Amino acid sequence: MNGTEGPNFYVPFSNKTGVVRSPFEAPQYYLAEPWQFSMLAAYMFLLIMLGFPINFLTLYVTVQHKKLRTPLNYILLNLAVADLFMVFGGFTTTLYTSLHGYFVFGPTGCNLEGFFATLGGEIALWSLVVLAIERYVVVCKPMSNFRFGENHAIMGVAFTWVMALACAAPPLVGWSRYIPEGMQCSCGIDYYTPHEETNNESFVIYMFVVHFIIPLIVIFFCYGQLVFTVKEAAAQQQESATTQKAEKEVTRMVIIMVIAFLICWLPYAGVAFYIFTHQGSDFGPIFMTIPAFFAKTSAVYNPVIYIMMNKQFRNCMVTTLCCGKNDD
Amino acid sequence: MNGTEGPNFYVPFSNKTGVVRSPFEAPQYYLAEPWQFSMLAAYMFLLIMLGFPINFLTLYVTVQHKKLRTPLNYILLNLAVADLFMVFGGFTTTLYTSLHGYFVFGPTGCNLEGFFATLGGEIALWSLVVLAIERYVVVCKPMSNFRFGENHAIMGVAFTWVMALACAAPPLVGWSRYIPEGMQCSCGIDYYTPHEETNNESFVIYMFVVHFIIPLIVIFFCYGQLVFTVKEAAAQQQESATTQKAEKEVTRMVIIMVIAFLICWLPYAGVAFYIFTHQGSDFGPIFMTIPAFFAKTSAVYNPVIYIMMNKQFRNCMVTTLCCGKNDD
Ligand SMILES: *[C@@H]1O[C@H](CO)[C@@H](O[C@@H]2O[C@H](CO)[C@@H](O[C@@H]3O[C@H](CO)[C@@H](O)[C@H](O)[C@@H]3O)[C@H](O)[C@H]2NC(C)=O)[C@H](O)[C@H]1NC(C)=O
Ligand SMILES: *[C@@H]1O[C@H](CO)[C@@H](O[C@@H]2O[C@H](CO)[C@@H](O[C@@H]3O[C@H](CO)[C@@H](O)[C@H](O)[C@@H]3O)[C@H](O)[C@H]2NC(C)=O)[C@H](O)[C@H]1NC(C)=O
Ligand SMILES: *[C@@H]1O[C@H](CO)[C@@H](O[C@@H]2O[C@H](CO)[C@@H](O[C@@H]3O[C@H](CO)[C@@H](O)[C@H](O)[C@@H]3O)[C@H](O)[C@H]2NC(C)=O)[C@H](O)[C@H]1NC(C)=O
Ligand SMILES: *[C@@H]1O[C@H](CO)[C@@H](O[C@@H]2O[C@H](CO)[C@@H](O[C@@H]3O[C@H](CO)[C@@H](O)[C@H](O)[C@@H]3O)[C@H](O)[C@H]2NC(C)=O)[C@H](O)[C@H]1NC(C)=O
Ligand SMILES: CCCCCCCCOCCOCCOCCOCCO
Ligand SMILES: CCCCCCCCOCCOCCOCCOCCO
Ligand SMILES: *C/C=C(C)/C=C\C=C(C)\C=C\C1=C(C)CCCC1(C)C
Ligand SMILES: *C/C=C(C)/C=C\C=C(C)\C=C\C1=C(C)CCCC1(C)C
Ligand SMILES: CCCCCCCCCCCC[N+](C)(C)[O-]
Ligand SMILES: CCCCCCCCCCCC[N+](C)(C)[O-]
Ligand SMILES: [Zn+2]
Ligand SMILES: [Zn+2]
Numbered sequence: 096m097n098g099t100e101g102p103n104f105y106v107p108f109s110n111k112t113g114v115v116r117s118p119f120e121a122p123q124y125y126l127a128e129p130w131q132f133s134m135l136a137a138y139m140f141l142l143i144m145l146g147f148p149i150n151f152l153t154l155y156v157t158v159q160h161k162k163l164r165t166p167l168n169y170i171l172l173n174l175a176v177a178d179l180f181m182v183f184g185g186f187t188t189t190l191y192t193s194l195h196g197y198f199v200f201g202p203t204g205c206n207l208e209g210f211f212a213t214l215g216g217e218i219a220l221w222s223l224v225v226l227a228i229e230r231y232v233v234v235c236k237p238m239s240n241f242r243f244g245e246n247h248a249i250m251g252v253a254f255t256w257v258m259a260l261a262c263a264a265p266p267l268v269g270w271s272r273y274i275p276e277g278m279q280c281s282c283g284i285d286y287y288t289p290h291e292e293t294n295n296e297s298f299v300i301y302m303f304v305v306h307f308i309i310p311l312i313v314i315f316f317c318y319g320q321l322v323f324t325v326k327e328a329a330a331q332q333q334e335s336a337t338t339q340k341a342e343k344e345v346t347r348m349v350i351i352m353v354i355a356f357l358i359c360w361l362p363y364a365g366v367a368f369y370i371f372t373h374q375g376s377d378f379g380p381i382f383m384t385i386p387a388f389f390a391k392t393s394a395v396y397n398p399v400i401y402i403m404m405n406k407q408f409r410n411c412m413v414t415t416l417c418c419g420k421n422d423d
Numbered sequence: 424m425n426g427t428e429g430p431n432f433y434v435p436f437s438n439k440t441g442v443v444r445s446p447f448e449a450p451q452y453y454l455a456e457p458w459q460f461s462m463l464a465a466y467m468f469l470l471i472m473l474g475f476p477i478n479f480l481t482l483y484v485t486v487q488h489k490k491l492r493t494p495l496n497y498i499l500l501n502l503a504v505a506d507l508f509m510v511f512g513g514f515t516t517t518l519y520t521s522l523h524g525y526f527v528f529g530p531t532g533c534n535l536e537g538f539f540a541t542l543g544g545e546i547a548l549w550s551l552v553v554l555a556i557e558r559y560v561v562v563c564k565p566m567s568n569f570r571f572g573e574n575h576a577i578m579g580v581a582f583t584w585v586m587a588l589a590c591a592a593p594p595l596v597g598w599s600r601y602i603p604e605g606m607q608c609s610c611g612i613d614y615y616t617p618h619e620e621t622n623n624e625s626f627v628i629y630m631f632v633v634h635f636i637i638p639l640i641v642i643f644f645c646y647g648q649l650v651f652t653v654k655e656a657a658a659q660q661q662e663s664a665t666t667q668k669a670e671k672e673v674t675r676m677v678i679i680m681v682i683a684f685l686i687c688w689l690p691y692a693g694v695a696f697y698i699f700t701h702q703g704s705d706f707g708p709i710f711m712t713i714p715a716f717f718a719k720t721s722a723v724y725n726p727v728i729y730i731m732m733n734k735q736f737r738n739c740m741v742t743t744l745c746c747g748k749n750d751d
Binding site for chain 2: 289291294296297299300303304308312315316318319320322323326327328372
């Protein structure tokens with residue numbers, strides 16, 4: 096056996112030497128050097144200390160400024176909340192788990208770590224869908240003469256939570272399950288075993304198709320309609336050069352947010368897909384550790400892209416932080 | 424301009440030196456060394472000389488042996504025909520084009536090269552869908568007391584031609600268009616320009632989503648049902664170890680055919696997707712030439728996998744070739 100399966104775990108280390116132990120019962124220092132567990136710990140700590148303030152700040156500044164009530168403003172406020180859930184709901188546990196070298200909080204801890212990570216990533220993905228659609232509707236006016244205003248913003252936000260929970264929750268109640276990965280200090284969906292009792296196989300498929308592929312198809316479609324229009328379906332829809340310069344700022348930003356998401360998650364995606372199609376194959380704890388922990392930067396990069404690419408949000412922020420002036 | 428757009432072409436070479444010419448009017452030797460055009464020519468020649476006999480042989484041996492009437496037998500005969508269409512309908516033109524260093528047959532030649540390549544590739548893709556579904560139905564028998572027999576085989580084949588033509592033909596009559604790629608000696612879908620008059624943008628999206636992604640989703644789903652069953656949904660189906668050993672031969676083969684397709688086409692897919700999302704960017708003729716011509720091995724690898732992994736087909740072949748003794 097290249098790995099060591101347990102009732103509820105899969106250590107990617109051979110147990111021919113009898114050293115393997117459950118990620119829920121004892122430290123995993125036999126997996127790698129303890130200084131490496133310290134690095135993860137240190138890493139999560141930074142994510143928590145960076146993520147807590149930038150997201151809260153985003154949330155705070157938005158609520159405080161009434162003029163910030165556009166779909167974008169709404170979507171980023173949403174991510175700010177999702178990130179705070181990742182930070183406090185999951186990172187605190189992954190940090191603590193990394194310090195002890197295992198899930199001292201048992202499966203319940205692993206569920207927290209896996210749930211919120213999955214929730215945060217998915218909220219970010221589906222949020223991208225809502226934004227692409229909003230850019231589609233606002234830059235090409237297809238449908239009719241409807242207003243993707245504040246009302247749809249709310250509906251847009253609720254939507255992201257519905258989809259994301261549709262992906263993150265099932266494994267909490269029987270369909271697939273959260274399980275330790277890599278150095279065993281973070282938890283992800285079970286791509287490691289078939290474990291037919293929780294119908295693992297069908298969930299992984301469901302996840303990659305409905306919670307990865309479909310969303311990308313939708314965004315790709317929207318991207319299609321925007322390239323086309325910025326080319327010929329816009330010169331006839333009379334787009335004042337003054338509006339386009341501010342509607343191009345926003346369109347550029349969504350594209351960047353979409354690229355950042357792919358940069359952040361594709362690595363994890365690939366290793367997961369691989370493991371899933373090579374279960375039992377010979378791979379170490381470092382194989383998934385790097386992509387997994389790297390993906391956790393998803394709790395931080397969005398507010399940052401936001402602050403750096405949306406002048407209005409930036410100025411409001413400086414205003415909030417300087418009390419009065421460098422408003423809404 | 425990093426490239427040179429023309430009414431119906433896109434040479435990936437700057438025309439600041441005025442050397443660029445239309446791939447329909449003159450040789451493209453300024454793009455690369457003439458010995459490289461000789462390599463392509465030599466290459467196509469081998470594909471033709473290999474593809475003609477292995478496909479025909481496959482087709483011939485199948486028709487000759489009546490016992491060869493299962494879905495697999497049917498699907499591979501289908502590919503054999505698809506490949507002969509690629510060889511004769513397209514490669515002869517790409518060969519000749521490589522020899523002259525340009526499309527002396529003008530756009531009509533380019534359509535031939537692009538159509539049959541696209542047709543052959545897609546027929547292979549959708550054929551994979553039909554096989555995966557057939558493996559699904561036959562190895563897990565989900566639907567009721569149903570029979571995926573000869574009748575469905577025919578319907579399966581017709582199906583692959585319908586989808587493949589749905590992808591290859593539209594660009595012949597106004598939706599997108601076949602255009603020279605790389606060193607300008609092979610033609611592909613227009614990922615190079617927006618050319619709104621033929622609605623390029625929307626076709627590329629349609630192609631990647633309906634003629635790449637969806638098919639992969641379907642196969643992935645089937646692969647899901649097989650891993651699950653070969654695991655805990657088949658030990659209750661009392662699959663006698665005698666049949667499984669022959670039904671595992673076939674299942675293994677389809678999986679290999681699926682992997683070979685990804686090995687063969689993903690490279691092309693990626694460069695196409697890239698070019699499409701980086702139109703006008705600085706890339707040379709070699710950027711697409713290698714993946715494109717590599718993909719053309721799609722006219723040859725399937726019959727070979729077939730001969731090498733299906734003992735029954737292999738034995739019939741030896742029989743056909745040795746006359747009588749080495750049957751159906
Ligand atoms: C655990 O990981 C190991 C790799 O570290 C996997 O072993 C590989 O298993 C395959 C399948 O049996 C071997 O292939 C066979 O090789 C022989 C050559 O003697 C050949 O005659 C057979 O037809 C077949 O191709 C392979 O050699 C072996 N190692 C390699 C090269 O990767 C193993 O499958 C994994 N699973 C477990 C827990 O066993
Ligand atoms: C990896 O293999 C090792 C051994 O090679 C496993 O060690 C296990 O260690 C426990 C001690 O906590 C053993 O339990 C003992 O069992 C005996 C009865 O056999 C009982 O009398 C003692 O009181 C004690 O409970 C356990 O037997 C032993 N297992 C093996 C393989 O011998 C280890 O569990 C393996 N890793 C895992 C969990 O996959
Ligand atoms: C043709 O290919 C060239 C690259 O070979 C592309 O040019 C690049 O265009 C980007 C902008 O789209 C340039 O970035 C800009 O750089 C300046 C620094 O002076 C910075 O202030 C701007 O904010 C921006 O980042 C990049 O420098 C440039 N590369 C070079 C060296 O030319 C070009 O886009 C392609 N298509 C065209 C327009 O022909
Ligand atoms: C790349 O640039 C070259 C030149 O830098 C393009 O070819 C040149 O095209 C011009 C304009 O079509 C030709 O000029 C002709 O002049 C006569 C004057 O009697 C006029 O009646 C024609 O209407 C035309 O303007 C010029 O002959 C030709 N230069 C040559 C001989 O190579 C070339 O078309 C560009 N690449 C492409 C095809 O985009
Ligand atoms: C290069 C493809 C090798 C074929 C392996 C079958 C899995 C299909 O690959 C998924 C497509 O992603 C391309 C990345 O290629 C890396 C190969 O690793 C296989 C991923 O599990
Ligand atoms: C060593 C390769 C690192 C470069 C990876 C760039 C990823 C950018 O994300 C774009 C998404 O594209 C999908 C797959 O990415 C592969 C290359 O990206 C080029 C886009 O065609
Ligand atoms: C550090 C903990 C992690 C990364 C735990 C779990 C993550 C997932 C189950 C992620 C799933 C996916 C998302 C968020 C977006 C891309 C596709 C995906 C299905 C791999
Ligand atoms: C040598 C000539 C070639 C490769 C010409 C054109 C090929 C296409 C338009 C291929 C399309 C695709 C296929 C066959 C399967 C994978 C996805 C795809 C859409 C890129
Ligand atoms: C940011 C790009 C990194 C790769 C992202 C896409 C990976 C999908 C294919 C899996 C290949 C990964 N690997 C090493 C696990 O084989
Ligand atoms: C719908 C998108 C499908 C894209 C598949 C991409 C496969 C990657 C193949 C290599 C592409 C990398 N690049 C940038 C050099 O072209
Ligand atoms: Zn509204
Ligand atoms: Zn039938």
